[PDB]
Ligand binder design. Structure first.
Ligand SMILES: COc1cncc(N2CCc3nc(NC(C)=O)sc3C2)c1
Length: 843
């Protein structure tokens, strides 16, 4: 069961999707996959340390960078500690453990076992790691801040409680019967054919078509389409893609071999996705749930089972050439046959694997077996250092083979939770490329979130983001998420519930507000009147007392600071909300600020941000900080989500709008003053100058690589404390925004050099070639990003921006003189394109 069916309503309402609904399924893959996951759930649930799980200590094995060792001049560190408006400061050794520090203190107060929390956060310093290796610590030192700790008793694990569970030789052919759309888009007698492809990693094996007929709401052929491929020459995860043309209009897929290794048979009525205008949505095995409006297509199957010598110089070298190559550089057939003939030598090169496996005639069963025997002797891969870029490459759409994909995941198993988070978003996206629901990668995500609450948390929001916005993949994700929620344990089930109700309330309000102020660049008094009036009517008796901040899960927000809440000036109407901090042990009356925004699809922003944090960890590997500000942002539902407000920052635009704010005029010395009025000391000013030269330089490089460099002033921000950063990614050319104002801070005006500018270029080029060292990674992540994150994008030209941008093939010299002349465009242009946003208000 009775209660056992409430849980299921609870789950469904947390998901925003019903994983018991069978209204849209032509088989039992999803249900089977729900059944399949209980073990690996119950596995990880059964084996997780309960107290450690509850404290989710957030921790890294990575070394402390050069820059933060210079921040320590005494091989020793200061930690204040409190009990009840009592507090003392302790000189700690950077290699000291929490448990070890309790000895130096079970010395002090009084002249059982307790634990150290951070003041204000539901973040703990526990377990056998040195303090140098907690992420909070490295955070405090970066910005130059005290470490504040309170001793309370540990979270009871009985709070993590988990609910008890309760579980041929024929050629291939296919009768195309016909199509059916109830209402026709264009009407004027047009002409229409079907196209049926057999697919395996956008490798196409065979293709057949139909005789085109008149496009009326019903079209019937009744034909057998005999393909070139043999039944026994079919691989697992081959898709029967079916498409409609006159040109592309609808598409749909059927996995030819099903999740039991069974050849697929019988009649299918399939409701088709319509094109808008390659793309992961295009890959899905899912069918359109809108049965009333959708094009659909009947078909039929009656087709059972199934489950050296020494190479010469000038060829080794061709091979090494081929292997050295980037991921997006396609293989000649000459190349592919080469990789094949010399498969066993290619096997000694882990970088060869993507290439080598995209050199398989997956359409021949004989070869795939050989390929599998090739996977047997994996000594060289199994023992190789984890290369994420390489690993990821084997997870993208190019690869559809169960076993290939699974070796990549084996490698991931060896990531620490730190790195899991880094790549979590993109790993969660990669599910779209899996041919089946149930998958080693799925299973790997599932595990690791059940293992660590932080991952678990982000995994929730990531899967929820996609479930709510996408019909192509919501069934699949929904299934995985339910699998997660069933083992995260009650505590979180409450937290998640808290969180969901709040963000569901606040989108009501968000949208309600757009309705009122039409476009009109002003926000009527009456709007704020009612914005305010609702937030009262929402706290009154309905909202939660408190809740974790989805983008920063250690922060529990409390009540709203209504006084300070508003709408923003946008053509959109975003909300500016501020909350009190539920956690009264916290140090400040400094509110929690969140923007809520309908209008742009924030999945894209999420992605750009995550990439941004990767580039940052890349610069960690050359001991480099560039002071990016990849603020918090979470996609939550349809063209809507939330954003961290960054305290004490304004818009580059607005810094112009202060002294002037004219109908579009710009001055050069103005930034520089905006810093001095905000820099109490003059030392701090030149620091603020310092922070900017980093932030500017990094944002210049990163933004050029991703190809999002030409922005408005309005969509760039600086902190009162010198930290520049771009925003609003959901939104003559110039490679990036290095304006004349940015340079008069550097001591230069359009055509000179200086002590702080010389510096800027120094950093830029160093940052730039640093990323070039991790080229393939950035290529693979961008490519996938485009494929999972975007509109439609040309499966050559859009994806391929980034290799011309990372100046591939080229030497650190040529490459530098590339990036350098990129700077001497913003010099020539200057205000020229900043100038331009507005004028085009009429062109
Ligand atoms: C308006 O749409 C957007 C989309 N994406 C990011 C943004 N920014 C995110 C970060 C941010 N921090 C701010 N801090 C202060 C004091 O104003 S404003 C702001 C806005 C806006």
């Amino acid at each position: 069961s009775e209660e056992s069916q409430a849980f299921q309503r609870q789950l469904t309402a947390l998901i925003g999707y019903d994983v018991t609904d069978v209204s849209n399924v032509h088989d039992d893959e999803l249900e089977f996959t729900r059944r399949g996951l209980v073990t690996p759930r119950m596995a990880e649930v059964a084996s997780r340390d309960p107290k450690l799980y509850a404290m989710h200590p957030w921790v890294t094995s990575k070394p402390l960078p050069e820059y933060l060792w210079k921040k320590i001049a005494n091989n020793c560190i200061f930690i204040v500690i409190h009990r009840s408006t009592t507090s003392q400061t302790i000189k700690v050794s950077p290699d000291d453990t929490p448990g070890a520090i309790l000895q130096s203190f079970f010395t002090k107060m009084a002249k059982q076992d307790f634990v150290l929390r951070v003041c204000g956060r539901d973040e703990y310093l526990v377990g056998e790691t040195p303090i140098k290796n907690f992420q909070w610590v490295r955070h405090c030192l970066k910005n130059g801040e005290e470490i504040h700790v309170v001793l309370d008793t540990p979270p009871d694990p009985a709070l993590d409680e988990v609910r008890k569970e309760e579980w041929c030789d024929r050629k291939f052919r296919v009768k195309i019967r016909g199509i059916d759309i109830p209402v026709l888009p264009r009407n004027t007698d047009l002409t229409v054919f079907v196209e049926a492809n057999i697919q395996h990693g956008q490798q196409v094996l065979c293709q057949r078509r139909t005789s085109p007929k008149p496009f009326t709401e019903e079209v019937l052929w009744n034909v057998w389409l005999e393909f070139s491929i043999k039944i026994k020459d079919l691989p697992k995860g081959a898709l029967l893609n079916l498409q409609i043309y006159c040109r592309l209009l609808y598409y749909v897929n059927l996995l030819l071999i099903d999740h039991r290794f069974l050849l697929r048979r019988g009649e299918y009525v399939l409701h088709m996705w319509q094109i808008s205008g390659f793309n992961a949505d295009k890959l899905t095995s899912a069918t359109n749930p809108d049965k009333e409006n959708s094009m659909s297509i009947s078909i039929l199957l009656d087709n059972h089972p199934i489950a050296r010598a020494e190479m010469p110089n000038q060829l080794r070298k061709q091979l090494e050439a081929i292997i050295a190559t980037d991921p997006l550089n396609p293989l000649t057939a000459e190349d592919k046959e080469l990789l094949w003939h010399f498969r066993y030598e290619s096997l000694k090169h882990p970088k060869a694997y993507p290439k080598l496996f995209s050199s398989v005639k997956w359409g021949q069963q004989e070869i795939v077996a050989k390929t599998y025997q090739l996977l047997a002797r994996r000594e060289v891969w199994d023992q190789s250092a984890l290369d994420v870029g390489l690993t990821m490459q084997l997870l993208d759409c190019n690869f559809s083979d169960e076993n290939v994909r699974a070796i990549a995941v084996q490698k991931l198993e060896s990531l620490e939770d730190d790195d899991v988070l880094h790549y979590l978003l993109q790993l969660v996206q990669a599910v779209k490329f899996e041919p089946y629901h149930d998958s080693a990668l799925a299973r790997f995500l599932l595990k690791r979130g059940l293992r660590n609450k932080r991952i678990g948390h982000f995994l929730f929001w990531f899967l929820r983001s996609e479930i709510a916005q996408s019909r192509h993949y919501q069934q699949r994700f929904a299934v995985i998420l339910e699998a997660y929620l069933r083992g995260c344990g009650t505590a979180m089930l409450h937290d998640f519930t808290q969180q969901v109700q709040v963000i569901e309330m606040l989108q009501k309000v968000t949208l309600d507000i757009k309705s009122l102020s039409a476009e009109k660049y002003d926000v009527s008094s009456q709007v704020i009147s009612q914005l305010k009036q609702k937030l009262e009517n929402l706290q009154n008796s309905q909202l939660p007392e408190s809740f974790r901040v989805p983008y920063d899960p250690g922060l529990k927000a409390g009540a709203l600071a209504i006084e300070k809440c508003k709408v923003m000036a946008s053509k959109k109407k975003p909300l500016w909300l501020e909350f009190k901090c539920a956690d009264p042990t916290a140090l400040s009356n400094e509110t929690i600020g969140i923007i809520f925004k309908h209008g742009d699809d924030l999945r894209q922003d999420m992605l750009i941000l995550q990439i941004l944090r990767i580039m940052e960890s890349i610069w960690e590997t050359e001991s480099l900080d560039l002071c990016l500000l990849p603020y918090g942002c979470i996609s939550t539902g349809d063209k809507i989500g939330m954003i961290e407000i960054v305290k004490d920052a304004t818009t580059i635009a607005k810094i112009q709008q202060s002294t002037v704010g004219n109908t579009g005029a710009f001055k050069d010395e103005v930034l520089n003053h905006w810093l001095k009025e905000k820099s109490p000391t003059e030392e701090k000013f030149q620091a603020a100058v310092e922070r900017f030269v980093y932030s500017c330089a990094g944002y210049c490089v990163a933004t050029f690589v991703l190809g999002i460099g030409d922005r408005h002033n309005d969509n760039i921000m600086i902190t009162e404390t010198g930290n520049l950063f771009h925003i609003d990614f959901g939104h003559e050319r110039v490679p990036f925004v290095l304006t004349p104002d940015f340079l008069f801070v550097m001591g230069t005006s359009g055509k000179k050099t200086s002590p702080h500018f010389q510096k800027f270029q120094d950093i830029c080029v160093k940052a730039y070639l640093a990323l070039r060292h991790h080229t393939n990674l950035l290529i693979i992540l961008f490519s996938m990003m485009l494929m999972t994150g975007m509109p439609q994008l040309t499966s050559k030209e859009d994806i391929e921006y980034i290799r011309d941008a990372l100046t591939v093939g080229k030497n650190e010299e040529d490459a530098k003189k590339y990036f350098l002349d990129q700077i001497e465009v913003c010099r020539d242009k200057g205000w020229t394109v900043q100038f331009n946003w507005f004028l085009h208000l009429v062109l």
